[PDB]
Amino acid sequence: GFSADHSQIAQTKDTMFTGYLDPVQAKDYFAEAEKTSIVQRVAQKIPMG
Amino acid sequence: SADHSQIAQTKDTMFTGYLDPVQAKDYFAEAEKTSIVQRVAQKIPMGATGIVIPHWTGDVSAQWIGEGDMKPITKGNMTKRDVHPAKIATIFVASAETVRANPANYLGTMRTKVATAIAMAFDNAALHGTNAPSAFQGYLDQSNKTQSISPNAYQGLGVSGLTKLVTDGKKWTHTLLDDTVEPVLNGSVDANGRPLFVESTYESLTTPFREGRILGRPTILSDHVAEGDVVGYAGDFSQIIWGQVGGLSFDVTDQATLNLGSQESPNFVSLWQHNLVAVRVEAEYGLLINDVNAFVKLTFDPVLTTYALDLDGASAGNFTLSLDGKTSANIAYNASTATVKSAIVAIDDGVSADDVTVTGSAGDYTITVPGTLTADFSGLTDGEGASISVVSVG
């Protein structure tokens, strides 16, 4: 190939294009689901003050 | 132009009798190999800039407090990763006389064959390391877990293998099997010698090979998953993302010039001045396996696993090993191959010096062991790239 900022040829490697071609944000494809108490699922709830 | 050319085409010997009325189709044609990775993994919207995947990391917290005991302070946290698409390409070239004649539809044949080769080049760079571009992140052969399936596939997958996933807190969501696996399913029998995975009169295919479920998980077949020791995979296939920047693209010309040698050993030829016609092909792909540890390699018989281990030139502190989740003693930053060997063989699970092998030098080791080996570098005090990974060789 060529050096970054090779003097004769413009490439997406070149320093002059920093601040452009930045990678787009995305939603978190690996996001874990949030946890919820197992004890509150099985145990009897009672009124309390 | 040359003739019988090793790269071009010039009414070459391939096309002997092309015009003859006695030439029929290839009655023995073999169907095209698709990618399977592009069929099992989640396709993501992708572009020439690449993409950023954000992830949460902070251990947000609360404490129990007595009346009037003044409350604790806490802070969240989050992080960034990014993926850039790599590019794959080829050119093919023929005399204009070959393009005029189009013998055996060679041009149309060639377009569809290179399309399969580009798909397989992606696929073989994801299931294995083969010629993979620098911009892909991970490949499944790195996974550091193995399972023999051969004596009984049910004990292999659903019990022995599945244990290795759930112990690390990893899910099992799919399994992917090569065609060569089938005899082990047919040979998986109960103690009375009746097969497990098929109904009583043995008329039909065993259920995983109908693409049926095993233990609630779907089964995916392939003609071309197996390489070296490995016949298939199991794991959390939701951990894989891939994407593509626009279609498989063809451009064509006779005007241009080609180098028939390397960039440093040039041998240029004009397409125009010889009346050759050439086709450019390109595609552009991204891949990320979010956790290489979330899979199990499937093998017929049991096998040893080989690890490369590097200490980043750290000249102080002691690391430690853990094998199938059982810890060794602590080990010095410059320990000999024999000192690492004895420190591994000392692990209480029953490893022995006829199975364990170690080779290399101080801070740079290869280890062979019958299990899931891991290492902790937190006790080193002079380097931070210190790491361990699986390696595979011819």
């Binding site: - | 569809t112 399309a115 498989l248 063809f250």
Partner: protein
């Protein structure tokens, strides 16, 4: 089912493979530089002067203009005579769509491509008025597309189109700037807007058929796909005559003039300049040359080549090309006649006329089918039974002969007392469905406005 993303690339491959076949037939119509046309006796430095033969273009152009759609006929309930009013003759609604689409231009072009390549395609849609067409929005937008820009996979079993793509190479070069995909259920389309295909626009049609109909030049049932009108025997006499013209042109430079020699004379005794090998005297007419000649010297000449010996072959080939094509004899060469009488005209024309009758029927089947599609698509519901019994109708392919026709039709009609009803006189005189409707009004006026 099929994913349209892969199906785009899958059918573009077939489309671009087809272009390598069609560029053979095109080279005969466009009179391009074939290898086999290059006449062999011409020396290598003179082979720059290509000679071309017009026979393939002459034949295709003589067939293509002689066919014009005169109208549609659709049978009424009980076989009744139609009328133009409220609850219209369906003959005029289809004609209105035909005229509003300018199809009398698009079809007289598109039939030429159907003769050259053996096929062409008719495409139907409701218009997209949000694209600023300058077209009536309440007419099914019907256009013709050539096989240089559209391809369709045809079912071996039913012969219906399975799927098709229109793909446009850009204004520069040969790179696809857009593709439009015709599924049975839906049309969808992509732009290669900046270097790769943008996300697809889509539009459902819900029909049982793809909105693309192939016109095809079928000669014979065992031609399943249609084939070029520029046939192998007409190619053969074209290329053979191109070689003869080439050799005759070369002969007319090198050989048509007798070459003069003298023998025995010693070059230095003629005073030939040894610096060049040439001395040239004044060529003014009656000057006698005197030569020493003492060596027993004498003059001799190589004869001219007789150019007539090629013209005898050029005539034999024109006479053969007239036999294979069925062009009336005077179209390729002057001959024994230039037809003297209305009979002598209709005699010579008969090959060409009966050949065009076949082309009207075979293209009529596709146009009828495209109008059924356009109705089913614009009005919804289902096609009324009579449209399955529709006929296209076309102007008489023969030369107009009006002044010899009038004496016949007037003598049959005999001022209403005669053998035929007035309306059949108007039909035999050849006035179109439109021109007869105009006369129906002028005749009504002429009974009042006396």
């Amino acid at each position: 089912s099929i994913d349209p993303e892969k199906l785009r690339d899958q059918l573009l491959d077939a489309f671009e493979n087809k272009q390598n076949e069609l560029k053979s037939s095109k080279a005969y119509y466009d009179a391009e530089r074939r290898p086999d046309a290059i006449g062999l006796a011409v020396p290598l430095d003179m082979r720059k002067y290509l000679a071309h033969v017009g026979y393939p273009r002459t034949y295709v152009d003589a067939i293509a203009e002689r066919q014009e759609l005169e109208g549609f006929r659709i049978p009424s309930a009980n076989g009744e005579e139609p009328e133009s009013g409220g609850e219209n003759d369906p003959a005029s609604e289809l004609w209105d769509w035909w005229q509003a689409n300018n199809l009398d231009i698009e079809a007289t072009l598109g039939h030429t491509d159907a003769l050259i390549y053996g096929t062409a395609y008719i495409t139907i849609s409701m218009p997209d008025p949000e694209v600023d067409f300058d077209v009536d929005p309440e007419v099914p937008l019907i256009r013709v597309e050539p096989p240089t820009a559209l391809y369709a996979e045809v079912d071996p079993r039913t012969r219906k189109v399975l799927y098709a793509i229109r793909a446009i190479y850009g204004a520069d070069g040969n790179e696809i700037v857009s593709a439009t995909l015709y599924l049975p259920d839906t049309t969808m389309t992509w732009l290669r807007a900046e270097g790769e295909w943008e996300a697809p626009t889509s539009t459902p049609h819900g029909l049982e058929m793809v909105p693309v109909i192939p016109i095809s030049n079928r000669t014979r049932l065992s031609d399943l796909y249609g084939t070029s009108e520029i046939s192998p025997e007409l190619r053969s006499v074209t290329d053979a005559a191109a070689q003869i013209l080439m050799n005759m042109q070369g002969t007319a430079n090198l050989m048509a003039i007798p070459q003069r020699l003298i023998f025995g004379a010693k070059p230095e005794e003629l005073g030939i300049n040894a610096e060049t090998g040439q001395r040239m005297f004044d060529a003014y007419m009656a000057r006698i040359l005197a030569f020493e000649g003492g060596e027993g010297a004498h003059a001799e000449q190589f004869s001219a080549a007789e150019l007539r010996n090629f013209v005898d072959a050029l005539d034999a080939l024109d006479r053969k090309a007239a036999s294979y094509s069925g062009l009336p004899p005077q179209y390729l060469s002057s001959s024994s006649d230039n037809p003297a009488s209305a009979e002598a005209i209709k005699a010579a024309e008969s090959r060409l006329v009966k050949k065009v009758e076949r082309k009207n029927k075979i293209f009529g089947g596709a146009w009828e089918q495209a109008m059924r599609l356009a109705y089913k698509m614009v009005k919804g519901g289902d096609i009324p039974t009579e449209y399955y019994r529709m006929e296209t109708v076309w102007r008489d392919p023969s030369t107009p002969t009006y002044a010899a026709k009038a004496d016949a039709a007037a003598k049959l009609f005999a001022n209403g007392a005669g053998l035929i009803p007035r309306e059949r006189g108007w039909v035999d005189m050849g006035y179109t469905i439109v021109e007869r409707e105009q006369m129906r009004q002028w005749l009504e006026q002429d009974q009042k406005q006396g």
